[PDB]
Paper text:
[name] and [name], the substrate receptors of the Cullin 2-RING E3 ubiquitin ligase ([name]), recognize N-terminal (Nt) glycine degrons and participate in the Nt-myristoylation quality control through the Gly/N-degron pathway. Here we show that [name] and [name] can also recognize small Nt-residues other than glycine. Furthermore, we present the crystal structures of [name] and [name] bound to various small Nt-residues and uncover the molecular mechanism of non-acetylated substrate recognition by [name] and [name]. In conclusion, we propose that [name]/[name] not only targets Gly/N-degrons for proteasomal degradation, but it also has the ability to bind a defined selection of non-Ac/N-degrons by a conserved molecular mechanism of substrate recognition and target their degradation through the non-Ac/N-degron pathway.
To understand the molecular basis of [name]/[name]-mediated binding of non-Gly Nt-residue peptides, we determined the crystal structures of [name] bound to either SFLH-, [name]- or TFLH-peptide, as well as the crystal structures of [name] bound to either SFLH-, [name]- or CFLH- peptide. Meanwhile, [name] displayed appreciable binding to Nt-Ser (KD of 6.8), -Ala (KD of 7.1), or -Cys (KD of 3.0), albeit slightly weaker than Nt-Gly (KD of 2.5). Structural comparisons indicated that the peptide-binding modes of [name] and [name] are similar. The free α-amino group of the Nt-residue forms hydrogen bonds with the side chains of Asp556 and Asn597 in [name] (the counterparts of Asp 526 and Asn 567 in [name]), respectively. Furthermore, the carbonyl oxygen of the Nt-residue is stabilized by two hydrogen bonds from Asn597 and Trp552 in [name] (Asp 567 and Trp522 in [name]). The main-chain amide and carbonyl of the second residue (F2) on the peptide hydrogen bond to the main-chain respective carbonyl and amide of Asn679 in [name] (Ala647 in [name]). The main-chain amide of the third residue on the peptide is anchored by a hydrogen bond with Asn553 in [name] (Asn523 in [name]). Likewise, consistent with the structural observations, the mutants W522A, D526A, N567A, E570A and N523A in [name] were defective in binding to the XFLHVGQD (X = Ser, Ala or Cys) peptides.
Residue numbers in the entry:
A (entry chain A): 479 to 642, 644 to 723
B (entry chain B): 479 to 723
Write the structure that this text describes.
């Protein structure tokens, strides 16, 4: 039995709010312990593929909280990894785009994009890639930082070493729009790089998911677009032969 | 995205643990408040249709804490309802039957069967019915208490008024089906039929098609024609029936 019809959504939003309260406590106590880490995990997991949870996170000031956990633990890469990963889930949500065009937010993650901890930088790139993908007038912040950041995104991915599981997906669908941003080649480079990674270390799961969800057509579409960035085109042909 | 493949149940259980911590901090503060009531609803729904969460609850000192919650809030009817509804979910899981063979627990439940609030005693009766439905042999506690509790379960169901709103939700009637066959234990069949009639009449659009799809018509018809059956269980059975037939 349960409380009433529909009570499940109410208690998921309640759980989100209590987890955020724990995060706030821990940050206040400067206490990097196992339950803070598990709270960041649980939050990150609940935002997975749930626009509703991501909306709630925002509405309970979670973005300001996570800016503060980033400022209070600048040496804890596992922590920033969970923080930015959840924020990557949020940047995946189109109606939430305006919420992230905060100056201190974008500044902090443009800082973290240049970490050499790929575990950390991958999700900062995710955030920036999704954001820039929304187009020009959608960008309500400094036009010059948009133009800077897309180049830096491209450059920082190129420096990535091949990691030793950074991330897991149930679907590639949030990637496919990125794959078509020829105007902005770092967005694609992040997408194809992410795909190459997850396909390369758990192919049984991920190559299948990719094919079933119609990825081949998109990759291959980059292929015959004769005027694409050569870094992107190279990664995409690697991914294609992986299947083909 | 998420952390690694198949990493969701570690977080579910971490959540049950943290909700229990909230319960014990609110209890020590003697602080009936909206956070505590939300926390008890969250625990209730999480145990819904999942013997793993029930097990993790009992594993993390869940039911001693719920005992103390009952004891610290003797008049709070909504608290008691949420406590007892979780405990009813736990009473449905057969592997976990042994861990509810506890005098203090059974005493708490038998008392709350006589609440003047049917929202409370309904779940007390659910716990009692699932518990005594499992045969005399699985009752590691007293048999005198068992007999007296069947007599009281039956008598109390008949004192119940029609509730105002729907008191509870169910995704499935399957837990009830085994109780309807317990012809030897009329109170258990009585609770099961009363609960079906209640949800069916409060919310027929939801529960009538559900009850017909999961094969309830047959358990009900079996009650209808079985030669020796309790009158009241039979009355409620054919009422449920002719509200379709």
């Amino acid at each position: 039995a349960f409380l009433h019809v529909g009570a499940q959504l109410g208690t998921e939003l309640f759980i989100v709010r209590q987890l955020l309260q724990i995060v706030k406590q821990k940050t206040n106590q400067n206490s990097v312990d196992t339950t803070l880490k598990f709270t960041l995990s649980a939050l990150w997991n609940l935002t997975d593929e749930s626009p509703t949870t991501c909306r709630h996170f925002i509405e309970n000031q979670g973005l300001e909280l996570f800016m503060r956990v980033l400022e209070s633990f600048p040496t804890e890469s596992s922590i920033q990894q969970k923080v930015l990963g959840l924020l990557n889930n949020i940047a995946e949500v189109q109606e939430l785009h305006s919420e992230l065009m905060w100056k201190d937010f974008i500044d902090h993650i443009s800082s973290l994009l240049h970490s050499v901890e790929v575990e950390v930088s991958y999700f900062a790139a995710g955030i920036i890639a999704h954001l820039i993908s929304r187009g020009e007038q959608a960008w309500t912040l400094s036009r010059s930082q948009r133009n800077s950041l897309l180049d830096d995104l491209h450059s920082a991915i190129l420096k990535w070493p091949t990691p030793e599981e950074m991330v897991a997906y149930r679907s590639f669908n949030p990637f496919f729009p990125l794959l078509g941003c020829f105007t902005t080649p770092g967005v694609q480079l992040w997408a194809v790089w992410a795909m190459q990674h997850v396909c390369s270390k758990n192919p049984s799961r991920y190559c299948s998911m990719l094919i079933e969800e119609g990825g081949l057509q998109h990759l291959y579409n980059i292929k015959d677009h004769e005027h694409t960035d050569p870094h992107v085109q190279q990664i995409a042909v690697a991914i294609l032969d992986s299947l083909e």
